């Protein structure tokens, strides 16, 4: 049982419901605003000093992230996020919340003229707090990478099959944590360095992640670097 | 009674309404999403808070269960290699404030990861999770019953396809083995049987007669009646 | 930056949050009710005079959209939607809202005895307003089509790859805007005319669409009949 301490997460008073609604909206802002490059909308999700971790970015502040994202546009980074289940753990005494947003990362790549997707199921974790004005903001963001897969875009062909089986060979896959191996191979081939100390549902960092989430709910200071 | 022409001709509170109705629909919607967020993550305390103490659940591989028996057989399934996840993909609520009854309609994809002869693959099943909700003595929304419409089914390659893997998977997903099961969850049932689970072949789809049975119970629930999904 | 002017979209007053919740529910009604043929539930999403656009129907009234959707059932149209991220831009001064609902359109097809899905990721845009009873209603609906893919249903086979390559040729795909090419091909083969003038994330109509969205938020009249 990774979450034995229960906070406000179902039912509750109207204020608690509304706070959980507002934090869920904040989290979904990643799927809605980042995919569409609605950058003012996106930046409103975060504290001014917020820190983000991604596969290809590693660690970033929020405008570090915004502009390395905008530069992802021209050298062919095409990433989308299907939101598929969002709920919130809320501590009204500390005004702290954890947003748990399940997503599929779907990234569209091209290898030797063949288009394909990599699809990675995961949990985005948003560490949120009310700022001095009563507005929820995300101070930290990190991802549990759960499972991933290769996805053809066109009808398969034996030609394309054997060209792609070369890049997604085992030897290239195992050098990355089980959970985001296909994503890592594909993004490496695009030329990004991979942050390989990212949490999955198989490795050490799982527990590190949940520990941070628990300390966050209790009102404590954390550091996700 | 239910037709495919219009299965839901009587409208309840499902959009707009009073602030109190909106909040009740929000709370029921959250409860439903608890399945995808909490069950996948084995957050069992959070999960159990979704249900009445006596709640009844149906799945393909478990058949009928209580919430307690379902929790137990679930936690044991992850050592038997069961790796099921749920993508939530559209949840709304029908609310009857006169009976304080609600129906949560939660679209999902069941996505289960399997292995066959060293070949990993997913089965993805699009469906409607139906939560039959009521308010308990503390005024909290709780799911008394849960059951699924299994709509459509597909095999999903995890790695790049290979001819070797193509025809070694063809042996398992033969029409012979597929058509033992209702259209809607055939691939899912073949794969879970290969895992050794007994399949409940009596579950609603969008093509069998249990479709009507399901909608009929949903209607009776909205009207405040007692139902029994063991049938 | 496509959305430079900010309206109510996060936090705000309790009334603003509740209005954004009501608009989000309205948008999700497309995936929950249309898929399940809950037509009376679906109809309550729209103003009486609402207009809708899809690839396979083009411009429709809500009443005519419902009728041709019913007619699609025995023409073999089996369309579903996976909702995958919905937020709302709200202007409380005009009581106007834009519902942005990400989805995957997932449509089941058959070609030469082989079944398959087309999956198309997109943004459903609901142009909503509070009506004179204070109910949120959509007056306009149109879609940004972002990207699509072929999806095998069964275990792949050399024969079925062979057969399907005939339908999803590059010559057949190139007739349609990048964003919904596989979807347009498969729906054309179902017998429908395709509306080739829908917004994508690659064509000029993208800007036309966002222009209308901004004018809608300001309380102005728009017309999406292009
Ligand atoms: K969703």
Residue numbers in the entry:
A (entry chain B): 6 to 230
B (entry chain A): 1 to 231
C (entry chain D): 6 to 231
Task: Show sentences the authors wrote.
Purified AGDC1 crystallized without any added ligands (apo-enzyme), except potassium from the crystallization solution, or with the substrate analog 4-nitrocatechol (4NC) in the presence of cobalt (4NC/Co2+ complex). Surprisingly, the active site in the apo-structure has the same geometry as the 4NC complex structures. Here, however, several ordered water molecules occupy the space of 4NC. In the apo-structure, which lacked cobalt in the crystallization buffer, H14 and E49 interact directly via a hydrogen bond.
AGDC1 and PPP2 fit in none of these categories as both enzymes neither display cofactors bound to their active sites nor require the styrene motif or ATP hydrolysis. Instead, they act on the carboxyl-group directly attached to the aromatic ring.
